Structure formats: C-alpha cells, structure tokens
Amino acid sequence: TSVKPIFSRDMNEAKRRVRELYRAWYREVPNTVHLFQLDISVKQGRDKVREMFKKNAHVTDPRVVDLLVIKGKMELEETINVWKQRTHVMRFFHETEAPRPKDFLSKFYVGHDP
Amino acid sequence: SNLIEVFVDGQSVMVEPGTTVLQACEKVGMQIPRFCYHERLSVAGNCRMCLVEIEKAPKVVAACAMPVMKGWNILTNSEKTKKAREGVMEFLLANHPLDCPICDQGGECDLQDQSMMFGSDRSRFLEGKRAVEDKNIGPLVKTIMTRCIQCTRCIRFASEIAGVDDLGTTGRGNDMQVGTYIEKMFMSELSGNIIDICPVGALTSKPYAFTARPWETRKTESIDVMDAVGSNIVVSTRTGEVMRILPRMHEDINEEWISDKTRFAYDGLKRQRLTEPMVRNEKGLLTHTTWEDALSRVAGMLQSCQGNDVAAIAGGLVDAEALIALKDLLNRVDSDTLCTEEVFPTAGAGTDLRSNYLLNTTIAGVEEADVVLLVGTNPRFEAPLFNARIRKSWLHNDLKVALIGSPVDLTYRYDHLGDSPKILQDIASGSHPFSQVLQEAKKPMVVLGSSALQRNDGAAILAAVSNIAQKIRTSSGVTGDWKVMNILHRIASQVAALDLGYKPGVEAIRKNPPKMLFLLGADGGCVTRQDLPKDCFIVYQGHHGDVGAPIADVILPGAAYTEKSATYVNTEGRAQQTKVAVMPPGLAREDWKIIRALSEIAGMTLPYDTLDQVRNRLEEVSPNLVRYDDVEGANYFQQASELSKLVNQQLLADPLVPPQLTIKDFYMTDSISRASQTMAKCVKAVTE
Amino acid sequence: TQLITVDEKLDITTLTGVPEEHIKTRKARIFVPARNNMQSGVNNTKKWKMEFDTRERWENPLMGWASTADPLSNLVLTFSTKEDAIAFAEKNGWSYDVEERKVPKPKSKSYGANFSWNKRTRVSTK
Amino acid sequence: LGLREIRIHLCQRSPGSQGVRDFIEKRYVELKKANPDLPILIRECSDVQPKLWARYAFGQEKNVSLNNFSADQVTRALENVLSSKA
Amino acid sequence: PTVKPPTARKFIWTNHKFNLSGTPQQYVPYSTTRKKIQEWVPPSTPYK
Amino acid sequence: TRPTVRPRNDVAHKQLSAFGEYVAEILPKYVQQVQVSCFSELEICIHPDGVIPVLTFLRDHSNAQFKSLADLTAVDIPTRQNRFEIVYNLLSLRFNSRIRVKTYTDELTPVESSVSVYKAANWYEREIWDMFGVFFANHPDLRRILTDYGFEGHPFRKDFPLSGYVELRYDDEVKRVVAEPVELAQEFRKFDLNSPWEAFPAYRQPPE
Amino acid sequence: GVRTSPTGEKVTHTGQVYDDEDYRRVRFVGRQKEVNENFAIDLIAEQPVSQVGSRVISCDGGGGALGHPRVYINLDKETKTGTCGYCGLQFRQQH
C-alpha cells in the first residue's frame, strides 16, 4: 500500500492543483473563444469546463487526480499556444451526433444495446 | 500410499502403479505425440508415434501402452526418440494423398501439426502412392478413405462407446481398408462424434463440408438445450453466422461427446425463423407490423383482464430469465395459471421439494453405482449421453441394468422385466427376485423417465417408485450420503420452470379456460382453438414458427439459444449460462426484454432493466439458479414419501411404451430439428 | 521517506481514455479456453484468456461484409493465472464473469484389460 | 387479497440454518397437509443465509429473515406469515 | 505475336475492351451469395 | 550443423558474462538480475529508483564508456502488476559493444528521467508518455509527439483496441472535420493461428 | 447458358439474383450488371471421360508444375467414374 508520490503528498495538495487548473481554464476560456473565432458564447465554454471537472470528480486516489491535473495542463498548453485547430476545440461540443436514446423502451425499439 | 518414483528427463515424479509412460510425461508436463491413443478409448498402440527411449535400454518403448517401473528415466527428447518420430512421420506421409487444399481438416489437422513440429521437411518417396476407393455410411459423414491412416479409432469407438459393432478393418497389409464390407448405413445416436476423433481428414462433417475453415472462425462457449443433459458446446461462427458446433470438455456431463441432434440442429436453426412482429389484419392474415403497434395492442388487450383470465405456456427452449419475467408480468395481473408443456404430478410433495423431480445423485453417480433400474423410459433417445455414461459403467464398473417397459434397444444387455406397471407393485412387496437383487446391492439407483409421467396415471407410478426407493434406502445397506430416487428429464426448460414455481402440465388451463393465452415457443400443441373460448388473444413469443404461430393473433419474434444469454438448468439441477454467438436476425429481440418492454408499455413496469438485475431477481426467487456449474444436493426424500402415501391412485395395465422407439423418431423432437434439412435427410435415410 | 500511503482501490477508468458506455455496460469473461476436439494438443489451454461479449455484426449494403460497431470485438488478453486477470478486470472497472479451469481426470489405462478372461472389457476387434 | 406462495431459502451445512432444517425435519409434513393449494417451495443451497419470501396478491412480496432461529421461532414466523393474509 | 502467337483457348475474349469507367457499361460491385436466413411465410388460410 | 544453423560465439559470451559480473558487483544497490542471451547480448535488470545512478556509471566509467543511447523502449505486459517494462539500449564505441538496461513501472508510479544523462531521451521517453502513459519526473518539455492533439487514451497499451474509438469525417452541416464513433464497413477478421502443440522443449515452464 | 429471372437481371453461376422487390437493383439502373458468360459447370460437362488401363491413375491437370498437385484416383468401382478433386476431370476403366 506504500506508493511513491509524484507531486501531491495528500488530497489537500491535489485539490489545490485542481483549483489552480480550474482557475487557469476559467481565465483562458474567453481568449480561446475570441482567438479561434468560435461561434459559441463564453458561458457555454465555461460551463463545459465545469461539466468536465464535475465529470472527473469521483476519484479519491491522489496519483490519479494528480495525473488528471497534469493532462489538463497539457490541454491548457496546447490551447494557450495555437497548436490546435477549430475542430480540435470544437470536438468537446458534439454537434453532429444525434441524441442517443436513454429509456428502455426507445433502446428496445432501436437495437440490442443492453 | 503405493506411489512409485520414476524420472522424466532427470526430474523425479511419483505415480500410481499402472501409470503409463505417456501419463507420467503428461504429469511432468510434456504432451507425448500420438495418433492412435485416446484417453477415453481402449489402448491400441498401432501408430508408433509415442515411441520414446528409456535410458540404459537398447529399444524404444511405446509410451501409450507400456507401464512404468521404479527408477525409469524417460529420455523424452534424445536423439533416437527424434529419429523414431521422424521415421514414423516419413512412413505415415509416404502414402498420404496431396489433398490439403481440398481437405476440411486443413488448419485443424493432427497430421500437419505433428509433421511440422516433429517430422522432417522433405520426402524421399519417389514411387506411386496407394488409392483407396471411397465408401458411404450415411448423410452425416462424408467418407474419403484415401486419407485414412488406419489409426483404428473408428472400430474402438463403434465397439466400446457407441456399441454398434459394424465398423472394421478388411484386408491384410497395405490393402487394408477401414470400412464395413457392405453397403451398410452406420447410423447411431452418437455417430457424428467419430468426426471429432479422426486425426486426419478421412471423415468429414457432411453438412459442414467445404463451407468454412478453422482459422477464420470465432469460438463461443455455450450450453446445449436440445435435451435435458445440458451438454457444454463450443459454437464456431464466421462473420456473424453460426458455422459449426463442437463438444467441450466436462468430465461430469458430456466428457468430450455430443449427440447428433446437437451437432446438426444449426442448419435448421438458420431456417424458418421469425424476423418481424406479425399481427392480424382485417381479414385475419398475419401481416408485418412494427414493435410499438403490436406491444400497444397486447398491452391494451392485457389491461382489460384481471384474475384467472390470462395464462402462460412455456416451450422446451425457454430460459429461466424469461420465465421469471413472464411470471412477474402475470403476477401483476394476479394470475397463477402458469403452465408447462410436459406433465409432472403435483400430488403429494409435487414441485415444492427439490428432491423428487431431479436426477438426485449426479450424472456421474452411475460410476459409483452397481444396480440401475430404469422404469418406462428409452434413455438412448431421451438422454443419449446419460445412456453413454450407463454403458461406460456397464463396461468398466460391471454394472447391473434392468428395464421395466417396452423391449427397446439400449446398445447393451439388460434385464427385461416386462412392460406392465404392476411389476413395480411386485418389487415393493418382495414378490420378485429383483427385490432381493436390489436388497443385496450396496449403492443402487432407480431412474424414472419423464415420458412415463406424461400418461394419465403418472402420480401412481411416481408413488410406487418412491416407495421402492425409500424401501431400499432404509432396509438395505445405504449409508446416507447415497441417493436412490432419480428422475430423468427430456426438456431443458422443465427443470428451470419447476424450480421457479410453475404449475406443471396444461391441466390448469383445461380446468378453467382463459380469454388470453401466452405461448413461449409452445409448439407442442398442448392446447388448441377447440379447448379455448371463441375470442381468445393468443400471443406467441418464439423464434421458429412451427405449430403455435399460425394460430396466434400477435406474433412476437424472439432469440434462439445461440442468440441470447440464457440460464438453463439440466436434469441434475446444475445451472449453466449460454453466451451470445450471433445477434438475432431482423427485428427479433431477447424474450425477457420483450416481456419487460410489454410491462413498461402496460403501466405494470418490472423493477429490472439489464441482465444482472434479472439475475438478482432470480437469486431472490431461487438462489440455486445463479450458482453456475455447481450442483446442490436436495435432501428430504422421507417427507415426500410420507406426503405421497395419502392419495392412493390406481394404476393402468397398459404397457409402458416410450414415445421414441427407433432412430426415425429421434431426429424430429423439437422446433429447431423439425425445420431442418439435415434432419429430414437423416429421417429419409433411416426410413428407406 | 519519499513515500505516501494510499488505501483505496485502484480505479484507472479516468486515465485509460475509454468512453463511459464501454465501461459499465460491457461484461468481460475470464476463462481457460477449451481444447479443439478435432485436435489432440493441449498447449492452447495453458494461459487464461480475458475476452468480451459479441455485439451486432450486420451485412454491408454493398456486398454484405461483416459491418460492426463494437471497437472491443477483437480484444483478447492473455494472463498467466487467474488472480492477475481478476486484478486487471477490477482495475479498469470491468464487471467480469470468471470460469474455473477444468483439469481432466487422470485415467487408469491398462492394455491388458482388452484381453481379460472374466470381464466385459474384452475387445471385439483389434 | 391473499397469500399465493411461500418460499424458504436455507443452507445444507451452516449451523445458522440448523433450526430451520429441524422445521423441515419435524413440522413440514402436516403443514403440507394443512394447506392443499399453497406452494411452499423449499430451496437448499451451500452458503445462503436463511430467508422466508411470501408472495401476496398482485405481486406484493414480503421478506422475513430466518437466521439463527429455533424450531418454535420459525414456526411462529410461518404462522404469522400465514395469518397475515394481506 | 505475329511470329509467336498465343495458345488458343475457348474462353479467351475475341475482342479487347478499353477502360469503361464513366460509360453505361462500367462495372458495379454486388454480392454473389443468396439469402442467408429464410423467413417464415405466414399461411394464407383463415385462422378460424 | 554447418550450413543452415547460425554459428555460436563463446568468447563474446564469456566476456559479456564477465562484464555483467563486473557491473553487478560494482552496483549492488539497484542491480537485480544479469543475463546473457544465446546470441551474445547482455541484459541488466535493475530497480526503477536506480535508473539514474546506474546509467551515468555506464556513461562515465573508463571500463564501460557506453556513450551512445541507441533506443529507448517501453513494453506492455499486462500479466505483471508493473505492466510497463522500460528498456534502455546503450552503445559503447571505445569498446565496440552494446548493453541493455531494463526496469519496470506501473501506470501511477513515476520514473526518473534520463535527460540529465542522454539528451536524446529528451524526445524518446516523451514519445513513451504519448504511447503508454508512463510519467517521467523532471522532464523539461513533456507533451504528446505522435498522436492527435485531442486524442484521449494511450494507444500502445494492449488493452487499447486496434481500431480507435473515434473516426474523422468532413461535415458540410458544420463545415468542419468532426469525430464520430467508430463504425467499420468490414470487421477486422481475428485469426486463430496458434498451433496447439508444444513449441519448444527447452522453453518449457514448470507446471502448477 | 445464362438464365433470365423475370425481373430482367441475368443470373450468375453462383445462383445469385436480386428479387423484384429488392431496392438494391437501383444500383444497376443507368449501368450494367457484369456477369461471366462462361459457366464453369457447363464448360466442364462436355469434357470426355478417359479410359485408362490400370486400376489407379495419376492426375496433375496437365503442364506438370503449372497445374494442381498430383492426386491418385482409384477406379475400383464399376458404377461411378473417378473424378479429380481439383481439375474436375473424370477417368474410368474400360472393363
């Protein structure tokens, strides 16, 4: 059960890194919208960041959340410098996929997905 | 312990006396090459592939036959062992025809694999090969004896396990042919298994021939449902299409064999399927209709009922999941008239205790028995692998078999006591020598067939057999671990439905007729439109449309046993699960999914969505259905015997005639087999 | 020191990058594959295989090729024994069904049994 | 509106089911003679705690734990279940 | 080929064809296999 | 065994075994195993926490002088609990030899980087993070170098499927290249090519 | 000898022909359905049977190394002609 830490000694430091990453992303959402000529509002991008942060908010391991913070830093560095395209930023906002069924009756009508 | 010490490649290992060199090398962990030796057949020793060298001995011994001795060092990979193997491969491939690209064994051939990994890589044979004329033994084995190597597994299987004694070796020397010497149609209940035990491509599955290839197939483990044995099989498919069915290895059920019906029901599984819901039009002709309209019609006609006006009949190929789903759905409408096709007597204990409707010991318990008394059954065609197990105990364990019924062939010698059921009344009172025969037995066994319980006096026969079994169990030398009362079944959906609390037999429907009938593949025709009122809303839920589908009002297509994950319980109470090999064709879905969608559209939604919740419900209603490959013992035969002694039922003097007498009535049993071309060809071959 | 203590179950569903629907709705199967009964070699039943279920494979509108939608339809993993397979299945959050291996019973083969004097094991032909 | 079926899950070897076994060993027989049309399904397994499932009308189900019960306690349990009738 | 003619066969085309793409004689792909799974045809008799 | 069999060299095998004993005796803190293959190639298996104090020795000792970093590879073996097998390949020009240094790591365990010893690893292990997910501590510039910018998941892990989870197509509705769930026109036909007979007797593992 | 289904489509030697209600026939409009007019069975049917002077006969398909692997055919039966596995040629005995 004894493991080697990377950056976060405990859960408090990992939560500090998470808050720092969210601060940076909330800072850089308007510049990402303006620079890439994205045709969405700032609120859509900021609540997308909030949705992703709440989606990945089930982890209790310091190493896993530390690696999540590192990968968010990679995404932030690829966004702050113009290395992505319009499509790479817009891939988060799924606009071409039709809404999949969720209730049992509609999925029973469509196919064999359990 | 008397385990002597031997050496394999300088490493010590302890073996029981009588252990062969091959068995010792297998125990260490090297699989010795072989062609004629089989672990479930008698030792022949006539291919010399297994020749290994023991050190300090100037001769190579046959590892498949020669027993080991103390201090023997088996040089498994020395020089002369490899020289002997290379010489044997050269002799074996000296006369073999260049037929690999036209062969059906290519890619799954023992000769090719052993030739690459043990034999040489070039041929010194500069002469002409032999050419043996082909024969025919039926429409189940394509026969090319040019490729036979005279390994003599055919004769040993046909004499020891199948027990028909028609195959043989005619000739002397290089002109010896493995045939029958006449135009004889070799047809048994385990014929196709010879295709599994040909190491070359001499014998080929005829319906499978020239259709697929082993390296492009996907193997999916599954459970056989055509009988109540519960054989474990592997279905090999090719790009979402079932290609062939092979036996699995399970030492307690189906060791490495299957019946021919299991082997050749697939081509009828891919014919006459239901691929779309059908509802009645204005005229009354069944026409295609989407899922929503049919489900809404069924829900509308179902919400108008309350009480005993809806029923349910379950066919022979229904899993426990759909059974419990329909049970919950009809319990929401508060109907307890849930019925099965096959009749079992509920007088006395009935289906409450588990001990009086299962093969109580095991399938393998025949190896621990010495006296077997079959009552009114034909186990050669009902449970063929159980009959094979009885024959194996007859051969090795020196069994003592008897039968009370019609004089039908059982591929061995039995004691025909007559077809009168009153003979049973003789055994309980000691007025027969067979009563003393059972009395001096140590671990006896009484097996009662399911087909003897489908008459009008099944309860009396069950009471008599139970009285006999409980008389032997207490008065004679039975320790207490041994179980005497067994019942052999013939329907894969009978034990699972009886474990869930279904009412066996269709007599409940015939007592009070309902205004709506549910059929889960009930093609047996237990009830018709003459035993039903004028306006009956019959709903059919099955894959094959054979009998109950033309008379149905709303047809709901379902999934076959190879097309859904299904929980099945065999005749000994063991629970097993199948796996999805190919998705159902067209718009057909799984049966419990259809029932759950119907309940959701009717406002009576069941509290399960996926398969694991249905299995949790199954564990709630009966835990033994969710413990897979685990048999649980059912005690309290004494309580069932006490409860069965009150209602004295009168017997019938008619002979105990099983419905299956010859092989011509064995191929056509279920819906899958009745819509098959191979089965029709087999029937045409055996009746001509 | 340079070491910390983590007392939670290893769950790396968030770092493997797999979508959600291929995590909770997929039932893995850990088993020892059965020997092909057409052959006699037992080398293929030496290591444990972890596989997945089979989804739909429909026909192509052009020539009826096997068109599929499951990306995990050809994923077969090999593990040395059962415990590492169970640990890997529970590490990625995959609900698993485990089947125990079926070792064949060591038989008692006797060549002399075909030539008995007072037993039924006398062979009819050789 | 009534009781439709009774189910008794128990174990074969665990001592916690032992008194429940005694019920089937001593007082089941005439109990089946008491009710000619009430299915009392007895289910024995390997490592399951004792339970009593009683199905009422229109799909209602009641669960009563039967762990570590004697013969008289389990007799009172099935008597209360039979006397519920709801 | 004026001095070394090819061997004559019964299945060799007597006239050569150029690239037929873009013309009404162009090649289109199609499956060469029949129906895999048959369908249960309902009976035409009245159900009564 | 002359014409079709590879010749065997024993002097090189003896010298490589002697150098392996030399290395395993100089560094007993981190070196776990030393093995010489049949085709005369040395392999040193050490602890991960001794990646850096070993390698600089092999770069700076006068008796080793392994001045070149040829290849740096991670191998995924899902059986072990440390599924990633980091492999350093070193080349010595003064002594004209090649050595292999092997170590292990799991997903969440960081490994000390080697850019302080060999600068070529400044790219190499970076590609490892792009392909497997092994995090390297104190890397100067660690970012994905082979996969797409928005790609999630590490493709060279054996649990990752052959075809990916998303496929790209142009869309006139949004005038953009979008990613959709993967739907192949033909399934990748999986072939069972393993012969069920014993391959080599000399590589026979002991049974259970 | 191609047969004509009454939907207008020619039938291949494998027996495949699209039904009249099949929508996939719209792939053939404005274009042509390409089918080989040299049927293999109707071209091997008229090849004569060769009488040999021995019990068994070896077939390689002609050309030596340009044909199929050499297979030996037994002509012990006096009812059916021994047909080659690869080439489809059939031999017999004059007795």
Ligand code: SF4
């Ligand atoms: S039996 Fe085996 S070796 Fe003989 S032709 Fe067939 S594939 Fe080839």
Ligand code: SF4
């Ligand atoms: S046909 Fe096959 S199984 Fe039968 S004797 Fe010949 S090689 Fe053996």
Ligand code: FES
């Ligand atoms: S396996 Fe022993 S001689 Fe055939």
Ligand SMILES: [K+]
């Ligand atoms: K065969």
Ligand SMILES: [Zn+2]
């Ligand atoms: Zn030929």
